[PDB]
Structures are given as C-alpha cells and as structure tokens.
Amino acid sequence: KPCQPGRYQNSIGQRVCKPCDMGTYSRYGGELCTKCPAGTVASKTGSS
Amino acid sequence: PPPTSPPPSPPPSPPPPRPPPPPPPPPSPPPPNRSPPPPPPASSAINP
C-alpha cells in the first residue's frame, strides 16, 4: 500500500512511513518529501 | 595714575559625560544537522 500523503519512506520493505519534515508536503507515496516550491509555506509537519 | 592690575583668567567650564553603547546582536543560529542518517531496509517476518 502506498504511504498516505503527509509521510514518506526511503527504504525497501518498511512497514511504517516516516512523517515528512516541517515545511514540506507529500503526495500519495513518494520516496522523499519534496520541499515547498518557491514562494509558499507548509507551516506544519507532515502536511499534504 | 596707572590703572589697576587686571584680574587673573577664570577657570574653564566643566565637560559633559558620555553614554554607554547598546548590547550587540546575538550570534546567527546554526543550521540543522546534515540530512537524516541512512535508513535500515528492515527484515524478518514478525508473523505468528
């Protein structure tokens, strides 16, 4: 199952998805959390 | 008759004090640690 948006995983075969860093968003899944592009802000940990 | 002897020079005016300087700004904060450590791939079964 893909990690729900707001978390990420960077290792093959991990049961738990780590929460994304503060000031970063994630889509459905994603190996690494992609930081906010240009002039925006997340302002919360594990924000979608 | 000759004129009276002139009087000696008068003392000079007192000087003013000097204000103290304001406190300097605090040092710039350090940036966060360089990335997370490499994650473990995880193994075994964890089954019954």
In DSSP terms, A19 is beta-bridged to A7
If interface means Cβ-Cβ distance under 8 Å, which residues of chain A face chain B? 10-15, 18
A13 contacts B43? CB cut-off 8 A:
yes
**Would you say A7 and A27 are in contact if contact means Cβ atoms under 8 Å apart?**
no
Q: SS in 3 state form for chain B?
A: CCCCCCCCCCCCCCCCCCCCCCCCCCCCCCCCCCCCCCCCCCCCCCCC
Query: What is the stated resolution of the deposited model, in angstroms?
Result: 3.9
Ordered DSSP codes for A1-48: -PPPTTEE--STT-SSPEEPPTTEE--SS-SSPEEPPSS----STTB-
Joined together, the tokens standing for residue B41 give 């791939």
How many Å apart are CA A34 and CA A32, to the nearest integer? 6
B41/chain A closest Cα distance in angstroms:
5
Give the number of other Cβ atoms within 10 Å of residue B38's Cβ.
8
How many Å apart are CA A46 and CA A17, to the nearest integer? 11
Closest-CA residue of B relative to A17 is B39
How many Å apart are CA A3 and CA A17, to the nearest integer? 6
Residue with tokens 């009276």: B4
Q: In this structure, are strands A18-19 and A7-8 parallel, antiparallel, or unpaired?
A: antiparallel
Q: Technique behind this structure?
A: cryo-EM
Contacts with B40 from chain A: Cβ below 8 Å: 11
Find, among A28, A19, A27, the residue nearest to A46 by Cα. A19
